[PDB]
Amino acid sequence: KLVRLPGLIDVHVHLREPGGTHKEDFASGTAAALAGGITMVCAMPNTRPPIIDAPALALAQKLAEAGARCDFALFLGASSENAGTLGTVAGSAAGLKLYLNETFSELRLDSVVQWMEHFETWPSHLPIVAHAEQQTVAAVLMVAQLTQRSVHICHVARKEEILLIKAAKARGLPVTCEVAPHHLFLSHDDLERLGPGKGEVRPELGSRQDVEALWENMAVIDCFASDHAPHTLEEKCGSRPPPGFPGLETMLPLLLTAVSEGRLSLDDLLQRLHHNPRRIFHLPPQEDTYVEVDLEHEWTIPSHMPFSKAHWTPFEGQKVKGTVRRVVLQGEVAYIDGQVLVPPGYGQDVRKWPQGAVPQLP
Amino acid sequence: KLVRLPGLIDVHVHLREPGGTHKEDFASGTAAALAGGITMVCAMPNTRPPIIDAPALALAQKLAEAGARCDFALFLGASSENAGTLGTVAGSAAGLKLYLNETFSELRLDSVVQWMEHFETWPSHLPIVAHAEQQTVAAVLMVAQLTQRSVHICHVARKEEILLIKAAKARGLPVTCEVAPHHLFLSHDDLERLGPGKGEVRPELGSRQDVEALWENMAVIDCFASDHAPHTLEEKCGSRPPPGFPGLETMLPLLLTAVSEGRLSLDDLLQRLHHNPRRIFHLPPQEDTYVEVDLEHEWTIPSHMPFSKAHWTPFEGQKVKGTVRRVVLQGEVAYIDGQVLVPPGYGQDVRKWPQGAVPQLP
Ligand SMILES: O=C1C[C@@H](C(=O)O)NC(=O)N1
Ligand SMILES: O=C1C[C@@H](C(=O)O)NC(=O)N1
Ligand SMILES: [Zn+2]
Ligand SMILES: [Zn+2]
Ligand SMILES: [Zn+2]
Ligand SMILES: [Zn+2]
Ligand SMILES: [Zn+2]
Ligand SMILES: [Zn+2]
Ligand SMILES: [Zn+2]
Ligand SMILES: [Zn+2]
């Protein structure tokens, strides 16, 4: 007996097109999404060229419309030069992404004043998300309060961060957050197995106490999001390993395993992979779209999942219970038992649908 | 220039059919909903007969399918005799409603043990909502914790109640709540104008400090819901006035006025009348459904709104800014500038749609 789920949404993926297509492209990354039970993805802007201006967004839209197999929205990225210049295209994006720490990106902001300028100029009704670790969470929350608007914190990874967000929510501040599966299911204890190259990720893997704190504070976590960050094995194990893990194909099986163990409920999962992504990002419904999972099937994660071009996974060897059997997208069978059945280009930009625009005052 | 909103959802209405159809019926109450920009309603079970058993639910389903002009779900009601008997029909309902205080209902529970029995027997994945005032909020929260599940608190009306819920959320407890417009826009100061009959409502109108506390704690309020509770003027002003206000036609204009004044944002409104109702009750999307509002139009609420059979309103004389111009439901024009254009029976039971079932473990 299969369980029917709505179409799940991952608000944090790196699909590497343009410019990094040996790592992933729209076609391979959205195949990975479908095989993970994900029917909508929000793609980050740290591509080559980065999606920091109208011409780059126009290019990315066409590459996505031609390559994506599931539906999508594209983030814009904040830069040191583009505040006040994105108003005409802002509403066509998933939101604005701020890179506030060191990671796999060149979108460097050198001053909190630049953060303030983005918060002041980006339309107030549209989402802002931030890569903000440790004290940077508190710093970006201050900027959000000074500018009287909301912020969403990407991949919360530490006890310190979840407790700070908890305290902010207790004060009624408009902050939401997401957590990635590696920060729930891996820790410092896995670094010996992974080694120092494969283990590179930002935020870094946390201690057992960090992991435990995230689980204990599940009520504070609004979304799960993979931070699917594919790089090839050669890159991960070479002389300058880039940070990041692939994760679209493993996220739902890991979480279903936790549901089966009673660590969270099916509802808790659906809030975090469907309803809260929709409401934070004003993402539209997908007609005739659903996912069928088999909660009884036990398997062990192999050395690489079938679709991501990363061709490796840090979850190798973990025993899971639960698998995606079938995905129906927009009335067509998109995935069945390892076979993707929709071509590149089947997916659409949800921000172009009338129901996908973010409502605003005239 | 009109603003397009998604189809709004009211999770707390009394449509009076069966058995009270001089007050309202499915056809008139759903006309009122559409004119208020509401495209989906969840109807309470305190009808005559009350919806407390499978035969009564079957009757109500047919009356709703024949009379409703917008989409709907029907609550079941808890009684002193039905715990453990609703399992086969529970999934077809909006949820289970517990009447835990004195109000317009006979669904009396005489012991907290009966509350526990309902929480133990009702399927754990399906919604439970409660009329629970003052200390009853804390009491039902205890029952929910003892039985390890969630609860939703109907029409929170007091500083005491919102602060208790705030404290429970700070402790990570699974509780949500809604607030009705009369508890945001009326107070003890209006009782002289209303008089003691018209002014009867449960929960009663609060003090200015209660109203202020609800606004100050907007972050704690998950939903707005009208508690549309129509009674005729003769009944309200006669020898034994029943409690309740009609409210479908006035709720959105009152809230749009507040948005225009900067008291909450358009997003805050859409979370509370669309996204959070969807996620708490697992209510499905409505295809090709939207509401167009004119945020500039100033008007004064008259002595009765056009559609509700109540034929009176406690908001008479209040100046508002914002009005519903057009509603499209399921691809058809349902309402335009005072004219309802879909017949009784156009609306459907969302729990019968494949996407409207609440997901559960096998
Ligand atoms: O912030 C980031 C971005 C990402 C990437 O590789 O794009 N990888 C990471 O590990 N952290
Ligand atoms: O709890 C309730 C129910 C309602 C009704 O009239 O049905 N009216 C009220 O004032 N309170
Ligand atoms: Zn396309
Ligand atoms: Zn990041
Ligand atoms: Zn990322
Ligand atoms: Zn929305
Ligand atoms: Zn019908
Ligand atoms: Zn009530
Ligand atoms: Zn009621
Ligand atoms: Zn749901």
Curated annotation (Swiss-Prot), chains A, B:
Listed result of changing D227N: Abolishes dihydroorotase activity
Region (DHOase (dihydroorotase)): 1-329
Annotated phenotype, changing C154S: Reduces dihydroorotase activity
Residues that hold Zn(2+) 2 according to the record: H12, C154, E178
Impact noted for substituting H183N: 11.5% of wild-type catalytic activity
Binding annotation for (S)-dihydroorotate: R16, N46, R202, H231, P243
S-S bridge residues: none
Modified how: Activated by MAP kinase (Erk1/2) phosphorylation just prior to the S phase of the cell cycle, when the demand for pyrimidine nucleotides is greatest, and down-regulated as the cells emerge from S phase by protein kinase A (PKA) phosphorylation.
Residues where Zn(2+) 1 binds: H12, H14, K97, D227
Expression induction or repression: Transcriptionally repressed following hypoxia by HIF1A.
Active site: D227 (for dhoase activity)
Cell compartments where the protein resides: Cytoplasm; Nucleus
Effect of H12A: No zinc-binding and no catalytic activity
Modified residues (N6-carboxylysine): K97
Residues involved in Zn(2+) 3 binding: K97, H131, H155
Subunit structure: Homohexamer. Interacts with CIPC.
Miscellaneous comment text of the record: GATase (glutamine amidotransferase) and CPSase (carbamoyl phosphate synthase) form together the glutamine-dependent CPSase (GD-CPSase) (EC 6.3.5.5).
Disease: Developmental and epileptic encephalopathy 50: A form of epileptic encephalopathy, a heterogeneous group of severe early-onset epilepsies characterized by refractory seizures, neurodevelopmental impairment, and poor prognosis. Development is normal prior to seizure onset, after which cognitive and motor delays become apparent. DEE50 is an autosomal recessive, progressive disease with onset in infancy and favorable response to treatment with oral uridine.
Role of this protein: Multifunctional protein that encodes the first 3 enzymatic activities of the de novo pyrimidine pathway: carbamoylphosphate synthetase (CPSase; EC 6.3.5.5), aspartate transcarbamylase (ATCase; EC 2.1.3.2) and dihydroorotase (DHOase; EC 3.5.2.3). The CPSase-function is accomplished in 2 steps, by a glutamine-dependent amidotransferase activity (GATase) that binds and cleaves glutamine to produce ammonia, followed by an ammonium-dependent carbamoyl phosphate synthetase, which reacts with the ammonia, hydrogencarbonate and ATP to form carbamoyl phosphate.
Family of the protein in this entry: In the N-terminal section; belongs to the CarA family.
Protein name: Multifunctional protein CAD
